[PDB]
Amino acid sequence: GSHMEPARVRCSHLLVKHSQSRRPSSWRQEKITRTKEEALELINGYIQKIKSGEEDFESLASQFSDCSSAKARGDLGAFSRGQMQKPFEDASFALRTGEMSGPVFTDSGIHIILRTE
């Protein structure tokens, strides 16, 4: 039924940017050469790997994430709407505990959203 909406939710986020981006400079690569096409295929692949139970999201987010998400293993912690990236926000709050969205085209690139809570 209608469960009370949680004030704070948490999402594990992986970011795969593209060469043509607002900032193609990350903690791993100072310059990103992969094009948008690559970014998309990478995301699509990682999603399928998470679905098949190949590798842990934490491991993936600590490796193949251009964003400094590796510091928290990809975890964003308990956050609320209004303080999150808009395309990411409406995506996270559109999921549930143990749910994962698809390629979320956000500001700097595509994010994978896996909610543990």
UniProtKB/Swiss-Prot annotation:
Effect of residue 67 to A: Loss of peptidyl-prolyl cis/trans isomerase activity; decrease in DNA repair of double-strand breaks by homologous recombination slightly less efficient than that observed with wild-type protein. No effect on RBBP8/CtIP
Compartments in which it is found: Nucleus; Nucleus speckle; Cytoplasm
Tissues where this protein is expressed: Expressed in immune cells in the lung (at protein level). The phosphorylated form at Ser-25 is expressed in normal breast tissue cells but not in breast cancer cells.
Changes after translation: Phosphorylation at Ser-25 by DAPK1 results in inhibition of its catalytic activity, nuclear localization, and its ability to induce centrosome amplification, chromosome instability and cell transformation. Ser-25 is dephosphorylated upon IL33-stimulation of dendritic cells.
Coiled coil: none
Keywords on record: Acetylation, Cell cycle, Cytoplasm, Isomerase, Nucleus, Phosphoprotein, Rotamase
Swiss-Prot/TrEMBL catalytic activity: [protein]-peptidylproline (omega=180) = [protein]-peptidylproline (omega=0)
EC number: 5.2.1.8
Residues where Phosphoserine is found: 25, 62
Predominant location category: nucleus
Example of a GO cellular component annotation carried by this entry: postsynaptic cytosol
Function according to Swiss-Prot or TrEMBL: Peptidyl-prolyl cis/trans isomerase (PPIase) that binds to and isomerizes specific phosphorylated Ser/Thr-Pro (pSer/Thr-Pro) motifs. By inducing conformational changes in a subset of phosphorylated proteins, acts as a molecular switch in multiple cellular processes. Displays a preference for acidic residues located N-terminally to the proline bond to be isomerized. Regulates mitosis presumably by interacting with NIMA and attenuating its mitosis-promoting activity. Down-regulates kinase activity of BTK.
Entry's free-text remark on domains: The WW domain is required for the interaction with STIL and KIF20B.
Assembly behavior: Interacts with STIL. Interacts with KIF20B. Interacts with NEK6. Interacts (via WW domain) with PRKX. Interacts with BTK. Interacts (via PpiC domain) with DAPK1. Interacts with the phosphorylated form of RAF1. Interacts (via WW domain) with ATCAY; upon NGF stimulation. Interacts with PML (isoform PML-4). Interacts with BCL6. Interacts with FBXW7, disrupting FBXW7 dimerization and promoting FBXW7 autoubiquitination and degradation. Directly interacts with RBBP8/CtIP; this interaction depends upon RBBP8 phosphorylation.
Protein name in UniProt: Peptidyl-prolyl cis-trans isomerase NIMA-interacting 1
Lineage: Eukaryota, Metazoa, Chordata, Craniata, Vertebrata
Gene: PIN1
Range within the parent protein: 51 to 163 of 163
